[PDB]
Design a protein around this ligand. Structure first.
Ligand SMILES: [Zn+2]
Ligand SMILES: [Zn+2]
Lengths: 197, 236
């Protein structure tokens, strides 16, 4: 019937939302799913709605709507922005160790700024003895045996890292935010604010 | 409207996250600017600029205040009313109905909270694919993860993002069960109520209305306010 400009704009808005909420799980999107779950009876003007959705998905959100395979009627949003930041694994990565280090540094912060060598060893391989030996020589850790091997962060870490960034790490390790762990978080604020003066 | 790449990356990350506290979007704004190095405009000007570009899509970056302590939050919100589709697209049919059942319990609740045991009893009622309590316990935590629900003491309430997203839907669907604040006239899930009359207030609203007042009185019946007066939210 008589569809206004707003009706059409609300229509392409449903379409761009549909593609966004779906793509975030790498779906990929099917035309049949599109025609069924958002288009409806606006199928008579579908190619125009689709095109307007594509440019709005591009100009506003910076995604390129691409048919991943020719003649497949299936689409994918491709990020047309700057590469960095879910980014660089598909290309550029830091030394594996730095990853290993981050867990150990994180694991220490988790247990309460302290941990015994044998525990983390049961964690690690799942050169655990050698890497955690020169990490102390690099002053990334501390290898004290004073009342076992008792672990702490050592001097270097504080200059290259903060407990908040570690907390940002342990959050992103499997999804979370620091806030989830206010036990850990609360002292990070006492550190983040302390980093000022 | 004038739309640069720092605005697009801002919108991209504002959707990966469900909702952000004001200090975290200012952190996000500066973040996007440092990956493209000009003057960082005021957060208000930055947001108002984007919303004028989103007008043709009838969505906006909408400011909201939480109902527990009143901190400012920001989420990408539909101007429309049938905004149930944002979760309807993201979840399954049974997970959907589970949220609806949970929503019904939270609204009808006095505290604005519904226990897990009360929600898990409606599992057999769920439309779509058959699920069980073990699975339903996971879905509720997923709602917490995606900032649709907030859990306290084994009880669930609506996240501030949820209220921002579908306040329009909630009111039009449950007009007899919904609660509105006497001060801001907006949707109320949790809050304080007078014991003389029956009006209710958002915790941050009673905080500002009774601010610095040595004898808090209910604006409707002028009776002494029975409950504790919180202190207004200050970013420090
Ligand atoms: Zn209010
Ligand atoms: Zn009263």
């Amino acid at each position: 019937g008589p569809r206004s400009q707003k009706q059409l704009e609300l229509k392409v808005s449903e379409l761009v939302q549909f593609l966004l909420i779906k793509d975030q799980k790498k779906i990929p999107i099917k035309r049949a799913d599109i025609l069924k779950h958002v288009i409806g009876d606006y199928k008579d003007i579908f190619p125009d709605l689709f095109k307007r959705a594509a440019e709005r998905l591009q100009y506003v959100f910076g995604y390129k709507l691409v048919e991943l395979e020719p003649k497949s009627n299936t689409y994918i949003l491709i990020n047309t922005l700057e590469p960095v930041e879910d980014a660089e694994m598909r290309g550029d990565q830091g030394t594996p160790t730095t990853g290993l280090l981050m867990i150990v540094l994180g694991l220490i912060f988790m247990k309460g700024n302290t941990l015994k060598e044998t525990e983390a060893w049961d964690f690690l391989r799942r050169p655990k003895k050698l890497i955690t030996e020169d990490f102390v020589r690099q002053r990334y850790l501390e290898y004290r045996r004073i009342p076992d091997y008792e672990f702490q962060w050592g001097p270097r870490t504080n200059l290259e890292l903060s407990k908040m960034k570690v907390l940002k790490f342990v959050a992103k390790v499997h999804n979370q935010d620091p806030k989830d762990w206010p036990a850990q978080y609360c002292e990070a604020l006492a550190d983040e604010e302390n980093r000022a003066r | 409207g004038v739309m640069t790449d720092v605005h697009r990356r801002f919108l991209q990350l504002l959707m990966t996250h469900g909702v952000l506290e004001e200090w975290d979007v200012k952190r996000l704004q500066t973040h996007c600017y440092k990956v493209h190095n000009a003057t960082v405009d005021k957060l208000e000007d930055f947001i108002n600029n984007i919303n004028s570009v989103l007008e043709s899509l009838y969505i906006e970056i909408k400011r909201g205040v939480t109902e527990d302590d009143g901190r400012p939050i920001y989420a990408l919100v539909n101007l429309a009313t049938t905004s149930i589709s944002k979760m309807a697209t993201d979840f399954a049919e049974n997970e959907l109905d589970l949220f609806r059942k949970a929503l019904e319990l939270i609204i009808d609740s006095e505290t604005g909270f519904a226990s897990s045991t009360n929600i898990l009893n409606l599992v057999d009622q769920l439309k779509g694919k058959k699920m069980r309590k073990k699975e339903a316990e996971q879905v509720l935590q997923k709602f917490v993860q995606n900032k649709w629900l907030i859990e306290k003491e084994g009880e669930f309430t609506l996240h501030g993002r949820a209220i921002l997203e579908m306040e329009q839907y909630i009111r039009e669907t449950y007009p007899d069960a919904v609660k509105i604040c006497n001060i801001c006239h907006s949707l109320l899930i949790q809050g304080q109520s007078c014991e003389t009359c029956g009006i209710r207030m958002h915790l941050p609203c009673v905080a500002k209305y009774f601010q610095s007042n040595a004898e808090p009185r209910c604006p409707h019946c002028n009776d002494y306010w029975p409950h504790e007066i919180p202190k207004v939210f200050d970013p420090e």
